[PDB]
C-alpha cells in the first residue's frame, strides 16, 4: 500500500541540511521535492512527535548560517554523551562567512540544495528503472541509497567545486549527511527523525513488538558447526520472513529494531544487490520492534505467522527432495510421499512460535493509570510523568509520551503470550527419535523398527523433520547467495592456530593425501581429505570409519611431520558476548542525566525535570542503528578470516576462533563495541562482557556451548558493574579452569614483560600456596623464588606488573585475585592447548 509520491514528501518534510539552516528550512524541502513533487498527515505526525519532547524552552536558535543565535551545533552521542563537533564543516563555514557573509550563505544554501535535489532525483530514477512494477522496492531503494548517493555527491561537490582534498572532502561529507535533527537536543541525526515523521504520519500508528522463540534449544543443541550456524542463519532469516511483511506494507523505516539499513538479508534478498561472504553472518536477532497502521494489524499478524509457517513448509519439501535426490534417504516414492504425512508437516509447523503484540501510539489515557497497572513506578518516573501532566495541561495524553516504559509494558505482554501458546502445543507421535538432536520425532520413526529406520538413511542417522531443514540449508543458501562458510568443521577452526595447516599442506600435504589414497579411496576426495580430523595421526592410530597396516605408516608419517613443525593444534575457542543492561540501556534508566543531552548553550533556556533521561523513539532509532553499524561492519571486521563469525545480531556475538586469535579478538571487538565515533556513523559507546571457552575438538558441541553461555550468564554477568571476560579451559582431563578477568587485563598482559618471559613451574606454586598462605609479602616471596644486575630490576618490573595485573582481576578479596589471575596464566601458558 505503498504510493511512492506522498512517501517522499512525508519523510523529505525536512530536509537534510536542517542544521545547516532552521530558517525557511521548509522552502529548502520545497525545493527538493520539486524535482519529484509538490509540498496533512505530516502535522499529526509531528505532533505526535511533540509529545514525545521533555522541555519547554523559556527563542534561541541554534544554527550554522542563523541570525537569538547561540552558535554552532555539535552533536552529542546518546549513550556516551560525548560531544563531536563538525570541524570541516565549521572551519569552511566560519572563512565563507569572514570573506562574502550572508550572499555566500543564500548562495551556498541554494547550491547546497540544488545538489540535494540532483541526487534524489538520480536516485529516484535509479528506483524506478530497477523496480517498475513495485513501489514498495523503490522506496526501500531511494530509503536506502539516498544517504550514501548524498555522501558521494557531497564529496564529488567538496573535492571539485570547492577544490579540498580527498581527507577533507570525505571529512565534509561525512559531517554533512550525519547531522543533527534538533540543534538544541543532537542526541539523533536527521535520518531518523525523517524516519519518525514517516513512521508516524499513518493512521492511528501503533508500537508492533515480534519474537520468535525458542533460540537456546534450536541453536545450542548443535551438534556440528555447520548446524549450529545453520541454525543460527536459519532463525536470522525467520526474522527477515517477518520483518519483511512490515518493509512490503509501509517500508523499512517503519522498523524500529533491528536497523535495516545496510542489512546484508534487506540488500539482497530485497534489493537484488549482489553480496558477498557477510551475507554468511546472521545480523538479524529473534526480537523487533516496527511501527504498523492500527487497523492493519491483526492482518500483519496472520501475514508474519503465515509467511513463516510457509517458508518453512517449502523449506522442509526442497529439502526431502534434496534428500531424496542426493541419496541422504534411501526411499522410494511411496515413502517419499509418506515423508510430507501430516505428523511431520505438523512438527515443522509448530516448532518456532511466533509471538506478535501490539499497542496503539496515539490512542489516549492515563498515563499514571498505564505505568501503575503496568507496575513500572519508581521515584524517578512519578518525576518524569509530572512534567509532561504540566506541560500538556493534560492528566490523559497519548501514550507515546510515554514511549519507553510502553515498549518494556509491550515486552512483558509478550513474553506472557510466548507462554500461552507453548502450553497449547500439540504432543508429538510416540517413536524413535532424531540422532542428530534426540529430542524430536525422526522421520519413518513411528513406522518402523530402530534396525530398518537405521537402514533407511544414509550412515544409519535417521533425521527429524527439522534437523532434516537444517541439513539441507547450507545447500540452500549455496544456491540463492552463490556462499558457503570457509570454515565447515570446528577442526578447520583449530587448525589455524600458527598457519598449522597452511604450512603442514604446503610441506607434507600431497604426501600425506598419498598415503591416505594408500589405505582407502574413501579417506581422499577432490584430492584432499574428506574430515580435517585426518589431519591428527590420533585418528588413524585408534578409531576409524578393517584395512592393512600402512595406516600405522601413515602415522609415522605424520608424527615425523609432527616432530618436524610441531604437533597439530587440538583445541579451539567459542566467543560468547553480550552486552550489560542493555534493556535498561535502551529504556534509559542507566544513561543518566537529561541535562547532558542538550546543546552546552542552551542549558539555561530550556527547562527541565528532575528526573532519569528516558529515551524518545528517535534515540531509540539511533541505538538501533549503532548496533546495527557495529554487528554489520565491525565485529566482522575484526573477526576477518582469522575464524567463524556465525552471529552477529546488535549487542551479542557467537564465533569460533583458534586458540590464539581468540583473546585479541574478543579485546578487538569489545574495543570497537567501546567506540561512540567512526567516521559520520554512529557506534555503541558502551560496554559488554563475554565468555571465551578453550575446548577439545572432540569434545560434544552442545555441551561446549552450554558451558560458554553458562560462562557468560552465571560468571562474567554475575559480577557488580559487569563488563567482564570469563575465560574457561576445558581439558580433556575433565579439569575444568576458569577465570575472571577485566578486559584490561588483556591489553596490560599482552604489553607485560611478564609474558615476553613467559613465552620464551611459577603457577603452580602459586596456586599451591594461595590456598593455604594467610599476602603482598606471599607474592614477593614467590616472584622473587622463581626469577646479575638485571634480576633485581627483573624481579621488581615483574613484581610491578602482577600488582598491576591482580587490579583488573575479577575477585573480591586478593587471594581470589591471585587465584584467576594465576589461574588465566595457567591457561595460557599449557603445552597442550597452545603448542
Ligand atoms: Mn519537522
Ligand atoms: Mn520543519
Ligand atoms: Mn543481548
Ligand atoms: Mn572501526
Ligand atoms: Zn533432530
Redesign the pocket.
Known amino acids: 500500500m505503498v504510493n511512492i509520491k506522498e512517501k517522499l514528501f512525508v519523510y523529505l ?2 530536509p537534510p541540511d ?1 542544521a545547516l539552516k532552521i530558517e525557511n ?2 522552502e529548502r524541502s520545497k525545493k527538493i521535492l520539486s524535482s519529484g513533487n509538490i509540498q496533512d498527515k505530516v502535522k499529526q505526525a509531528d505532533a505526535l512527535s511533540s509529545k514525545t519532547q521533555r522541555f519547554i524552552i523559556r527563542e534561541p536558535v541554534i544554527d550554522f548560517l542563523g541570525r537569538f543565535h547561540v552558535g554552532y551545533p555539535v552533536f552529542i552521542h546518546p549513550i556516551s554523551t560525548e560531544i563531536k563537533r563538525y570541524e570541516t564543516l565549521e572551519k569552511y563555514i566560519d572563512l565563507g562567512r569572514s570573506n562574502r557573509g550572508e550572499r555566500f550563505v543564500n548562495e551556498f544554501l541554494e547550491r547546497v540544495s540544488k545538489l540535494e535535489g540532483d541526487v534524489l532525483k538520480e536516485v529516484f530514477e535509479d528506483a524506478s528503472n530497477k523496480f517498475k512494477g513495485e513501489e514498495s522496492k523503490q522506496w526501500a531503494y531511494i530509503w536506502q541509497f539516498y544517504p550514501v548517493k548524498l555522501k558521494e555527491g557531497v564529496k564529488e561537490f567538496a573535492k571539485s567545486e570547492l577544490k579540498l582534498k580527498e581527507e577533507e572532502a570525505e571529512k565534509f561529507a561525512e559531517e554533512f549527511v550525519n547531522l543533527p535533527a534538533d540543534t538544541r537536543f543532537p542526541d539523533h541525526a536527521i535520518w531518523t527523525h525523517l524516519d519518525l515523521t514517516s513512521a508516524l504520519s499513518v493512521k492511528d500508528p501503533t508500537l508492533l513488538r515480534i519474537k520468535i522463540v525458542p533460540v537456546q534449544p534450536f541453536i545450542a543443541n548443535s551438534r556440528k558447526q555447520l548446524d549450529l550456524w545453520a541454525s543460527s542463519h536459519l532463525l536470522s532469516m525467520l526474522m527477515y520472513k517477518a520483518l519483511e511483511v512490515i518493509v512490503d506494507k509501509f517500508g523499512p523505516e517503519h522498523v524500529i529494531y533491528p536497523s535495516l539499513r545496510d542489512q546484508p538479508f534487506f540488500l539482497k534478498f530485497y534489493l537484488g544487490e549482489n553480496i558477498g561472504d557477510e551475507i554468511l553472518v546472521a545480523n538479524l536477532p529473534n526480537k523487533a520492534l516496527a511501527i504498523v497502521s492500527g487497523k492493519e494489524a491483526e492482518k500483519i499478524e496472520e501475514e508474519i505467522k503465515k509467511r513463516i509457517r510457509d517458508f518453512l513448509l517449502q523449506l522442509y519439501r526442497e529439502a526431502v527432495d534434496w534428500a531424496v535426490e542426493n541419496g541422504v534417504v534411501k526411499v522410494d516414492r511411496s515413502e517419499k510421499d509418506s515423508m510430507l504425512k501430516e505428523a511431520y508437516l505438523k512438527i515443522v509447523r509448530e516448532y518456532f512460535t511466533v509471538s506478535i503484540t501490539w499497542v496503539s501510539l496515539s490512542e489516549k489515557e492515563d498515563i499514571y493509570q498505564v505505568t501503575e497497572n503496568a507496575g513500572l513506578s519508581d521515584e524517578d518516573v512519578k518525576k518524569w510523568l509530572k512534567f509532561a501532566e504540566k506541560k500538556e495541561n493534560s492528566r490523559v495524553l497519548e501514550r507515546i509520551a510515554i514511549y519507553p516504559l510502553l515498549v518494556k509494558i509491550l515486552d512483558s505482554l509478550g513474553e506472557r503470550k510466548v507462554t500461552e501458546e507453548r502450553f497449547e502445543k500439540s504432543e508429538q507421535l510416540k517413536g524413535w527419535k532424531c540422532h542428530v538432536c534426540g529430542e524430536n520425532l525422526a522421520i519413518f520413526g513411528d513406522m518402523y523398527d530402530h534396525d530398518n529406520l537405521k537402514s533407511l538413511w544414509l550412515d544409519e542417522e535417521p533425521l527429524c523433520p527439522m534437523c532434516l531443514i537444517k541439513r539441507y540449508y547450507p545447500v540452500w543458501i549455496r544456491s540463492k547467495t552463490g556462499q558457503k562458510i570457509r570454515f565447515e568443521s570446528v577442526v578447520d577452526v583449530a587448525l589455524l592456530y600458527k598457519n598449522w595447516r597452511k604450512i603442514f599442506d604446503e610441506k607434507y600435504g600431497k604426501d600425506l593425501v598419498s598415503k591416505a589414497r594408500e589405505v582407502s579411496e574413501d579417506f581422499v576426495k577432490d584430492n584432499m581429505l574428506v574430515d580435517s580430523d585426518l589431519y591428527y595421526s590420533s585418528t588413524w592410530e585408534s578409531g576409524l570409519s578393517i584395512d592393512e597396516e600402512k595406516v600405522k605408516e601413515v602415522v609415522d608419517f605424520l608424527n615425523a611431520a609432527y616432530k618436524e613443525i610441531g604437533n597439530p593444534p587440538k583445541y579451539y575457542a567459542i566467543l560468547v558476548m553480550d552486552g550489560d543492561d542493555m534493556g535498561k540501556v535502551i529504556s534509559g534508566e542507566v544513561l543518566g542525566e537529561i541535562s547532558t543531552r542538550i546543546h552546552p548553550n542552551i542549558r539555561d533556556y530550556v527547562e527541565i525535570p528532575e528526573a532519569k533521561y528516558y529515551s524518545t523513539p528517535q534515540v531509540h532509532v539511533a541505538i538501533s542503528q549503532a548496533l546495527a553499524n557495529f554487528s554489520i561492519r565491525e565485529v566482522r571486521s575484526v573477526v576477518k578470516d582469522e575464524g567463524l563469525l556465525i552471529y552477529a545480531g546488535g549487542d551479542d556475538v557467537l564465533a569460533i576462533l583458534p586458540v590464539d586469535k581468540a583473546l585479541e579478538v574478543a579485546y578487538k571487538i569489545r574495543k570497537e563495541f567501546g567506540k561512540s565515533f567512526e567516521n559520520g556513523s554512529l557506534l555503541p559507546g558502551w560496554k559488554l562482557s563475554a565468555g571465551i571457552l578453550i575446548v577439545h575438538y572432540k569434545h560434544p558441541l552442545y555441551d561446549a556451548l552450554e558451558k560458554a553461555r553458562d560462562l557468560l550468564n552465571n560468571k562474567a554477568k554475575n559480577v557488580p558493574g559487569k563488563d567482564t571476560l570469563a575465560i574457561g579451559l576445558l581439558k580433556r582431563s575433565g579439569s575444568y579452569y576458569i577465570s575472571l578477568v577485566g578486559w584490561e587485563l588483556i591489553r596490560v598482559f599482552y604489553n607485560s614483560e611478564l609474558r615476553k618471559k613467559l613465552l620464551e613451574r611459577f603457577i603452580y606454586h602459586v596456586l599451591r600456596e594461595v590456598d593455604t598462605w594467610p599476602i603482598d609479602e606471599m607474592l614477593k616471596f614467590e616472584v622473587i623464588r622463581h626469577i646479575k644486575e638485571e634480576t633485581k630490576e627483573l624481579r621488581e618490573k615483574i613484581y610491578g606488573e602482577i600488582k598491576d595485573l591482580l587490579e583488573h582481576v575479577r575477585g573480591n578479596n586478593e587471594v581470589e585475585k591471585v587465584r584467576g589471575l594465576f589461574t588465566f596464566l595457567k591457561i595460557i601458558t599449557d603445552a597442550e592447548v597452545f603448542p
Open positions: 518534510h525536512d536542517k528550512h521548509e
